[PDB]
Amino acid sequence: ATLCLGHHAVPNGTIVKTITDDQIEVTNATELVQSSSTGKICNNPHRILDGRDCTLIDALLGDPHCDVFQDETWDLYVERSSAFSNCYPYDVPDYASLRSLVASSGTLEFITEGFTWTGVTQNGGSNACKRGPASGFFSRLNWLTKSGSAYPVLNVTMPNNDNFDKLYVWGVHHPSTNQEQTNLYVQASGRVTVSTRRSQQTIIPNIGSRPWVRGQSGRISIYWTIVKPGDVLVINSNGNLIAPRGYFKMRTGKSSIMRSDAPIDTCISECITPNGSIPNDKPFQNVNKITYGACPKYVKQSTLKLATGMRNVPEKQTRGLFGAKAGFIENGWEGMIDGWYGFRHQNSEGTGQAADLKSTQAAIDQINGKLNRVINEKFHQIEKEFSEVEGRIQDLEKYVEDTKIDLWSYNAELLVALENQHTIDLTDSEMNKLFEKTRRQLRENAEDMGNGCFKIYHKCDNACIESIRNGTYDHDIYRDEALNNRFQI
Amino acid sequence: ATLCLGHHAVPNGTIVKTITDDQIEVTNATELVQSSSTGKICNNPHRILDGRDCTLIDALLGDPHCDVFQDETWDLYVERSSAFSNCYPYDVPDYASLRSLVASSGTLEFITEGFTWTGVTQNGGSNACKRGPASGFFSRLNWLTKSGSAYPVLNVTMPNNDNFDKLYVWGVHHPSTNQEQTNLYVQASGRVTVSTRRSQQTIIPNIGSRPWVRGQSGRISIYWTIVKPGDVLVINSNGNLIAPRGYFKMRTGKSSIMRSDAPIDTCISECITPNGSIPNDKPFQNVNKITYGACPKYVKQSTLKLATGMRNVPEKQTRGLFGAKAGFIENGWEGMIDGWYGFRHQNSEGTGQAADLKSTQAAIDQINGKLNRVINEKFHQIEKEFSEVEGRIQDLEKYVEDTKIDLWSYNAELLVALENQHTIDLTDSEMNKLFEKTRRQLRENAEDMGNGCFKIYHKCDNACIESIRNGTYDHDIYRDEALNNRFQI
């Protein structure tokens, strides 16, 4: 009787990469890179707000068309490319800094305080900020204008008796001409200083003709101040002051900001990308570098295959005539569909096949355990896409992001190659250990035919095949007959 | 005679984490993460200077509340949370750059220069800087004031005839009211321009009522200028000038700063953290991300075990009745305390145990060599914790630190897994090699019982067993007896 050990093989296989071979076929493999997105943004479990032609700064200041974003909280603010401003022209010296501050705070909660401005006309406005049929201004700003024919030096103070930081947003008005400055603030040259016990900001307005925007050639420079507990805000203005009407409550959380034109749909997703929500089962993705939530690491590689199965050596009619084929050394057994390793026997009662459950299960558990190892939560990061050209800082962030991407791509490639090579050995060594166990069991009653088969030199019925397979094989009841048939011609 | 080959086991062993399984038992493992600190800062071999109740800038300017730090040198400046200012309320535009500059310089060495300020009153002071019973000022600054009723345009120069960079620290006084401006500096508006041949700094003081700090509502903005050899410094002041009395020597080196409340005790340590000094034998630490000196790399993982021994498979009373147990395939041996691998024999003269020292020494040498490889000198780095909220650059620094931490943690995980897997696979290989060598020594005179044991088909005494152990076993003086007992019933 002859008993051959073998492994399975499937018709089609997956070409993966290891340390040595750049193209090695395996039975099964899984993709480790998520390169597809649903194209839509889910509203669960993260609280997501939609811009709808409203920027974060525009909503903060109180644009009339932004009047729906009052006292609104969010976990991710989505800006749309259709956003526009419809109020008095303005600029923020550090726009990105203020946007990041408001995005990280996560709450547009405005609390009004009793600011007293004596000798000036409050609630100014302009035709560039029409709030309905009349002329208006930002809801969270107060345009102080001369009352009568005098603009006194405004010296106001207000402390922090609470236990949370306050964010005061104010502005300095740059008029178009000297006549406008005299007609609005009396004084020829203005000045606005806003100070705390540890910091101060002093701004001198500048008169000049800026490009026509919505009817006004002047500008408003927006500044912000943070008041800590135990501190006091003092505002001293000779003129050209766009005073604050209150404060924004600051908070420390996981809130962030994102620029995307993708729609929002009712679904659940833990990872948010501007191209849309992506599944987070895979450890790597190739959709976008800008991610929110528990997201896979962005890599440059489009595909990365991890070998879940063993080597694939199919039957290609290379050798073996009239069905005569044998062993795991020559090729793999495509007809084994109930195990990874198995036995084929040809006794006097016929032929048969069986599967070795222990080795197959051990290999499967090892591969599954290495799969679990292969498969972070970043909320607020640096900006990755820039519309304007600034200089040093922009190149610094670009360098940081490029270095991170390159390092993580190299790590992913090395990990995939190492695990694929280890899986090959894992399975091969398992087949060799099955061979060694069978050889050590068939103690002197069998001969190795060199093709992965044992030639048994004694009569071996189906019960004896089962005894060899299951481990309950007694070699002392066949030694005499095996010796006679083996060493005596 | 029966000879069995085995490897030792321990009653209780560590659980390490490899590629295949996250929990595998190993006889001995070593922790690779330093997660504990002594709570104190050593003063050797680094020169630690306790700042007590002054910031670095306060010692730079010369607050009366600690002239002890004059002409001081350090390798690490320790800033305490109890530090406070006790002089005129001052602000430093871009405070962090000056702080880092002075910290990396490592010396508070002040050289006075012969500045001539003709037409103004020198050595001005304020009641907010009480130097005992009188009113004083910063020791390294000179408060100039009108002499009589005139403040001339001060145009002074000082060249760089030396071979080192000079750091000139000066300031501009922002008064509280116009009355005080005119009383102190005559002119309605002052102007301070300090220039070199390649750079300049202009400051126009603005007047405003800042919050009451230590009796004064004014401010002093501190500025710094670096003069290289072959350059000249020119100061032109219409008014509002806090002149410099001299220059601070600038040095390049390995000095830095740290914010910590830990005490300083007489000891030796090459690594300093805000939580205290930590040993630098381990490659990774989980104490703090701020480090000075030769320090282990910060990792997110609390624990990391490196396998020093091999798989620990002990006896658990599963199979083998009445002490009839043998072989390394089945399990290990707790009764072995003098080696890692060895032999157990049962012959006509009884039973015996011995250890194979060569394989044990080889395995120990390989493991020690792989341990030595596993076991950087960073002095001045970026700020890691921030107490204010600034914007872009703060998020950039946080992003950089987070990426570095994540990459190093992944590297540590991969290294630990790879080394543990290789250690296990090399110890198993050593055991298999010893078994193979014994089988080759026992040519046709012994057979393998599968359980890890060799049945020898000829009788021989303990000298025979020792000859097999030491490699000096002649199989030709036993072939006839072995073959007769083996092949002929």
Next chain:
Amino acid sequence: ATLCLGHHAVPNGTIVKTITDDQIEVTNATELVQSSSTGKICNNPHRILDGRDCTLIDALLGDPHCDVFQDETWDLYVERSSAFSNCYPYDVPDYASLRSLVASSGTLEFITEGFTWTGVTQNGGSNACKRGPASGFFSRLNWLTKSGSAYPVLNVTMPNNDNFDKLYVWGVHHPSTNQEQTNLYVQASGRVTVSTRRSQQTIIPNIGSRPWVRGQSGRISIYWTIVKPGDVLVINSNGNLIAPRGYFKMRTGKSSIMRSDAPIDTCISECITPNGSIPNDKPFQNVNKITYGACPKYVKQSTLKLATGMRNVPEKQTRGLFGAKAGFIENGWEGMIDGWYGFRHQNSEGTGQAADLKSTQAAIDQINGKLNRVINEKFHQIEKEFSEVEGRIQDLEKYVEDTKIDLWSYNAELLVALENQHTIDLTDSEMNKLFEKTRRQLRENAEDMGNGCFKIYHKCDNACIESIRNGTYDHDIYRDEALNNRFQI
């Protein structure tokens, strides 16, 4: 007859560093780190522009000492340490950003626009910018001066109706004395505001005596504005204006800048470093961290050896008297120059040697495929060497650069160690498979002597040895004789 299996060995060999042993002698190795440079910069395939004695900013402004760089394109602008400025003294606030902008643009393409300056005298000049025998100025700037005895407020505009960004480089003049602001510009205090529909820059100039440079105590502050398509530039000046004569074309590409004193010679090299062009065949280089083009990654290791061959175990006359050699596990064979693995036979006809081509070719192809994977195109990066001390940003860039270097060095070390270990393992495995194949070929016609050699118990000539070598060995035509001489004395 005896058949011994062995591997080659070289007289002298390289030493590599693996996971366990830091010094493993192998037959052949390759250098993975480039540490040598020719010292010259090739002009192919990149466009190299030798700046000679002009900075990029100096060529941007129109220094008369070199107008050759007018309207020029480049891929890498090379700055020399001998460069100097020979015109009116000037400074550029945020200088590095402007340098990076102009470098990444790659084109000094200046196009003149029809600016109208009503009421002022154009084409101003100074004795510090002599254009030959007369007094000149920057070619790309227009120094406006009072016409007659009046300097009107200039309000000029220019739209961007094209489809590309325009870079306007303008300036503000800081005079030395108030006699000057009046003699050149009537008004006692000037002001220059340059604005677009989204941004504005307003400069109030200064009065003060800067150090004597080329006969002028004044300064010129250079600013730039970027005008996007659909935008409009508006310039409003009361005085102290160095107006732009036109606009520079802005484009996005692979252009960059470098500081080096290396000469330029005709050759081809895709990697450029300040020390000179280096080859990019090796994956790592140790010349400079500043690179342009397809360049190897910078590492801290001077040398890193990759194992191309197998372990080197040569003859050292340790054992074996008067010939009497053995198989693979005694030593290597220095006499095998035909392949990596081979056979040595001593039959009745004599001795002989041969090489096994299949295993040698398999090992060679695996090692070559591993080498191919081991052996990026970065164009514009951050500045890596600094000549001045700035502070926060410089430390951030240094920290990022050092982190990248450390991570890549660790990656290189781990990669080379893993590859060397796997190479050694794959060579040993190949020899083990060759030995196993020979054993299964021989069956019970030979015995293993324990020294890598098979003792064949039947006499057969060189045809028999060739049959064993080629795999066409019939064991059934020799079984009777082999068994008779093996088991019956």
Next chain:
Amino acid sequence: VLTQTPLSLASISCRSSQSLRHTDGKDYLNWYLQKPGQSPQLLIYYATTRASGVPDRFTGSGSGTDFTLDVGVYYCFQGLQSPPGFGAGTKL
């Protein structure tokens, strides 16, 4: 013995008296095409698996005794019994 239908000719049927399914689980039958004047070339092996680098037009299917399948002669070949042989050859 293999019988091919139709002799002159799509679908070509090769029918065998004995089933060609081995214990290995593979139906031992190959489909070859001989272009006029050239050596025969492989189209399908094991009655289901396409050859290496052949047009996707050719598809084969069968189980045991009835197998089913550009101008030339098509042949069905058995490789299971000791006198292996080709079919009659269908002209297309």
Next chain:
Amino acid sequence: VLTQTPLSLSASISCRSSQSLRHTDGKDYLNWYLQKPGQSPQLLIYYATTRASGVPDRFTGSGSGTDFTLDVGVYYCFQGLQSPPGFGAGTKL
């Protein structure tokens, strides 16, 4: 043979054997079992030193060779070195 004698009854039970139960493997072949009233016996300490899996630390064992020493139940000592292995008489707690 084994003799199980209580030393302090209501936690010290001593199981002493005529023949020392130490093998050439450096292990003491003695196990301690507790039979709770109505339940099945459970292992407490095997090899006379090593505690069993999922056993409270209240139980500890000591001894070597001939002499070995240890809520409510019956405590048995079992030897497994010789051909006729057997349990102890039993101690009622």
Next chain:
Amino acid sequence: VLTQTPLSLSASISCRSSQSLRHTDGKDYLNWYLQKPGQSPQLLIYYATTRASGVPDRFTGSGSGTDFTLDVGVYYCFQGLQSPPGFGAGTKL
């Protein structure tokens, strides 16, 4: 047998063998040793080409077949290819 010439020196020493000392392996079986006055002989060259590690580079020798060619002491050429190995007469330098 090996003949060494010259017998006395006052920087090349020749050892010529009756039978070629090249083996089928491909290595010449000859060694060159130095005996300093009063001290033990020290290996200089092994296999007639390779230089022993730890010796000064002043010594270099080469040859093949029967002819091989090469500090106060006696120089010896030794062979190990035949059953009765032996040294040479020795060149005194």
Next chain:
Amino acid sequence: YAFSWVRQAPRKGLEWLAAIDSVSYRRSTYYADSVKGSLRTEDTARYYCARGAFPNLWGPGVEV
């Protein structure tokens, strides 16, 4: 995985009856004074099957 049969008379203590070894050590079986050579009267008890070389893991048993 060796197994054993153990007996518990109503109140007489636990008496080890039989042990069966595993295949890896040859399935040798050891028996006490139960069937060596007959079901007598002194055989009513609770029978337990135990897993291991020592009676480590126990089953509920059957009341014979």
Next chain:
Amino acid sequence: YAFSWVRQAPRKGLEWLAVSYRRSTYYADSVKGEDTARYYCARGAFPNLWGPGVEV
């Protein structure tokens, strides 16, 4: 790598004429123990790879 010898008469249809498996050889009944036709050497257990062929 097993090889086979196949024969193609001018118009008759292909007829099949003629290491690890002991190089056991099998022959058809016609050739066991006319002949004007082209002869092909085929590679594989089945005649997978065919060679241009000879004229006899």
Next chain:
Amino acid sequence: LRLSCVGDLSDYAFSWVRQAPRKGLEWLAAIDSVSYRRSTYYADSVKGRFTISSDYTLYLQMNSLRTEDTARYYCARGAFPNLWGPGVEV
């Protein structure tokens, strides 16, 4: 008697060499390693009437010695006399 022939193990081969005061080196004995059956060869002059040696590194006496074997004896290591010892006078 023996001497310090080290300056490890017994896997290497060994040899015994004799140097007369003014007659030059003469190889006498050589013991192989275990891997080659420890086949020991002896010089043709010392042949038969020899005095064998072994290791556990010394040599015996009281044999056909004819007062001509008065010389310095050296223990050498390797297939060739690579590593030498101080030697013992006889």
